[PDB]
Amino acid sequence: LPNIQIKSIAGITEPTILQYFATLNAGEFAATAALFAVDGVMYPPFESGIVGPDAIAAYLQQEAQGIKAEPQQGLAETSEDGHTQVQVSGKAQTSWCGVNVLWLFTLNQEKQIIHTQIKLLASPQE
Amino acid sequence: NIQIKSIAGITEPTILQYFATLNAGEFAATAALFAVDGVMYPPFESGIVGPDAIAAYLQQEAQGIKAEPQQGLAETSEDGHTQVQVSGKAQTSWCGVNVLWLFTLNQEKQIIHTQIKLLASPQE
Numbered sequence: 001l002p003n004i005q006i007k008s009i010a011g012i013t014e015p016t017i018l019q020y021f022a023t024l025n026a027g028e029f030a031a032t033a034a035l036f037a038v039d040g041v042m043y044p045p046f047e048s049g050i051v052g053p054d055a056i057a058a059y060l061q062q063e064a065q066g067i068k069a070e071p072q073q074g075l076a077e078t079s080e081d082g083h084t085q086v087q088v089s090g091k092a093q094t095s096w097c098g099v100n101v102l103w104l105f106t107l108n109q110e111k112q113i114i115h116t117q118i119k120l121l122a123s124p125q126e
Numbered sequence: 127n128i129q130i131k132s133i134a135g136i137t138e139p140t141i142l143q144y145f146a147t148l149n150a151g152e153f154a155a156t157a158a159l160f161a162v163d164g165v166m167y168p169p170f171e172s173g174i175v176g177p178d179a180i181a182a183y184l185q186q187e188a189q190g191i192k193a194e195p196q197q198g199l200a201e202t203s204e205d206g207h208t209q210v211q212v213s214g215k216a217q218t219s220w221c222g223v224n225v226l227w228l229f230t231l232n233q234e235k236q237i238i239h240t241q242i243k244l245l246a247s248p249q250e
Binding site: 041073074087117 | 134197199207209213226228230241245
């Protein structure tokens with residue numbers, strides 16, 4: 001339904017990850033939340049984990065409006081349990097705040113998001 | 127003497143060496159990867175500058191640590207510095223945590239900055 005288009009960016013091809021950033025950047029926060037498993041968890045940098053699509057969507061509607069996320073490179077590795085761990089580095093910005101960020105996703109066998117963790121990083125500045 | 131843990135996405139020898147010497151308890155070798163003014167920032171211990179102090183810190187506080195780096199990303203900035211982010215686990219026989227190691231290397235590939243951040247272990 002979302003007229004969001006999915007396209008390989010920053011060398012990532014995993015469809016769930018591409019959809020995560022595309023819906024996030026379009027403000028389609030209900031669609032972002034729907035990528036999570038029923039018991040999936042979002043771990044923001046400065047908040048407690050948020051559990052489940054309903055809570056995740058509400059959180060995004062209240063804290064992430066105006067976010068522009070720019071993935072810059074990514075790597076996916078599938079383990080033997082069949083889960084996929086994805087690591088993405090890049091930038092996130094509003095009109096008044098910017099941060100360099102590392103996203104860590106774990107996907108289950110159906111490629112639903114089990115958990116997402118967002119961590120800040122510092123640049124080579126002194 | 128030492129065994130590399132290979133790290134998906136990372137070939138950088140200084141990074142692979144950091145985890146191999148750490149896991150071997152070869153802590154003076156770990157410290158020698160840092161620049162003379164390089165700094166390490168552990169989760170619960172502020173900041174430690176220089177190979178001499180870093181080696182002594184590790185010998186006292188990291189005995190029996192076992193680090194399992196799983197994957198990483200590396201980026202070179204225009205100035206020639208290299209930033210590397212490695213996610214994984216680290217544990218003793220009584221303590222486990224999920225970990226994000228953040229490295230900055232200078233142009234000679236010495237470690238000028240490491241920060242060790244904890245990720246969400248008790249997720250379930």
